[PDB]
Amino acid sequence: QKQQSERLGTEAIPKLLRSLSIPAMIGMFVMALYNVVDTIFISYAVGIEGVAGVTIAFPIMMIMMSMAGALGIGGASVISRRLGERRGEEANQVFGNILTVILVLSVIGFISAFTLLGPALQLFGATSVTQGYATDYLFPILLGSIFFFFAFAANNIIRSEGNATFAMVTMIVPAVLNILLDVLFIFGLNMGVLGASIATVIAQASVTGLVLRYFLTGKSTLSLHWSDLRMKGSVIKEVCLVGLPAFVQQSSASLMMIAINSMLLRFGSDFYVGVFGLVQRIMMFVMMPMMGIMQAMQPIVGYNYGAKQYSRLRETVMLGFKVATIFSIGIFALLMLFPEALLRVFTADREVIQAGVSAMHILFCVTFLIGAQIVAGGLYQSLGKPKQALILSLSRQIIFLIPLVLILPHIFGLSGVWWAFPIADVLSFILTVVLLYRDRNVFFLK
Structure with missing residues (x-):
């Protein structure tokens, strides 16, 4: 007090x-x-x-x-x-x-x-x-x-x-x-x-x-x-x-x-x-949009779980998802129509804007699913039960990703770069779907 x-x-x-x-x-x-x-x-x-x-x-x-x-x-x-x-x-x-x-x-x-x-x-x-x-x-x-x-x-x-x-x-x-x-x-x-x-x-x-x-x-x-x-x-x-x-x-x-x-x-x-270096700050930069919407509920979903207005958190948690999602499709879109112009900072060969954007293409028809798949992550974390987020992170990050880069690169190609991501995330997502009907309690609303 x-x-x-x-x-x-x-x-x-x-x-x-x-x-x-x-x-x-x-x-x-x-x-x-x-x-x-x-x-x-x-x-x-x-x-x-x-x-x-x-x-x-x-x-x-x-x-x-x-x-x-x-x-x-x-x-x-x-x-x-x-x-x-x-x-x-x-x-x-x-x-x-x-x-x-x-x-x-x-x-x-x-x-x-x-x-x-x-x-x-x-x-x-x-x-x-x-x-x-x-x-x-x-x-x-x-x-x-x-x-x-x-x-x-x-x-x-x-x-x-x-x-x-x-x-x-x-x-x-x-x-x-x-x-x-x-x-x-x-x-x-x-x-x-x-x-x-x-x-x-x-x-x-x-x-x-x-x-x-x-x-x-x-x-x-x-x-x-x-x-x-x-x-x-x-x-x-x-x-x-x-x-x-x-x-x-x-x-x-x-x-x-x-x-x-x-x-x-x-x-x-x-x-x-220096092009690892570079290709990051466009991920993170055009992550912010999400990142920042995240840190809004960091603590909103914070004083309301507490013993407070449960009725008014689902309101966030729903909304929170809701926004992210429109900036999911968001980033995703502009991630896939302007993949030229941002490969015009990368202006080199006409094969650099080839498999150099063959990757930056259907690598990211995942992005649009990421909205929640990362919102999810805050609302196991603002609600100090980081035991299902724990389970959730090592899904997205390691246990499905490397095992699938590994399961591709044990000969499958620079496609083991491709499939290894777009497909990884989706399971993180499908899993993160489940992680929520797991608690019809975050969103006990819709």
Whole structure:
């Protein structure tokens, strides 16, 4: 029991989504800019040798943020399941008792900087150039670590409460900084990668500075305490309980995309890694749309399960599906008519716009099914029962995907690239259909 500060808690619900989504949408977008407008730099004061540095580096960046993401999400879906179900101070408790595990790790990485950095970095496709570059990238970022985690903690708790707005600002603002701050070093000076990393730390510094305000200074939205508040919860088990699938879901891809990257270092030393690199930020970018609609119900479907207005969550959960679906067909469409024009950033051969878009064609007559197949994922996760999402993730990500790339590539072709995806997802979907008539309880409405 606390003071439910302004935000909402008001059940104004399908503008609770309206208003909630767009914030994510926005900075989610913005910061995706930073990529672009930053890497396009790293593709200058350095060439492509380091554009690859970055990209090898990457999944090690993700190896951390996943753990903290868990710990983040956990927080959210705890702190939502405990603000309708109004344990208003269990909240206060959690928050800090996460900051623990964080500042625990914040150091595991400060350690691992001065440790497992190189060991693992060289441990696949180490190109002497790129080696040094990705080292030069990863070192600072870990120094380093703290600002980083706390700030994904922050941005996830504060959604988990309600500030999608102050969110924006946790994004918008590295972003703006992390351009001008790059230009500062990267081109402006000449500290390239070596210096883009120490930019993107001074980024994540000058936010944390600020989230401290939206947690201490006129502590905003909700329960937030700071001298002894946290020690080491018995809740730790409650958060890892949650995040359990949450961090699976990254270490699912992340850990498998070390592979596809390091195996695409054995053929294409760099030329091809900078096009892994690229072909991502169009998936994720044109994922956002969905991603962001997701993070709206992160916590909406949060204070209403709780002990609150069950009648008004199906309203979300239905709506939530509903929207996603129109942006399912959405992305899908424009994914399949403009697959030229986006293969005009890829302008090379007339066989590059051939099997280079033979893939980008009926690879994605799945997309339109993905809407729910990923909405599903939030509403086993906002409702801290991440045991069926767990079951659900390792379906989508591994147990059906590799077994089917494997069952195709044990000779079947660069079709074992095709069928291995469009068909994988569908079972994830059909399964995710079942996962819901499994509970005529999320949607006990239609």
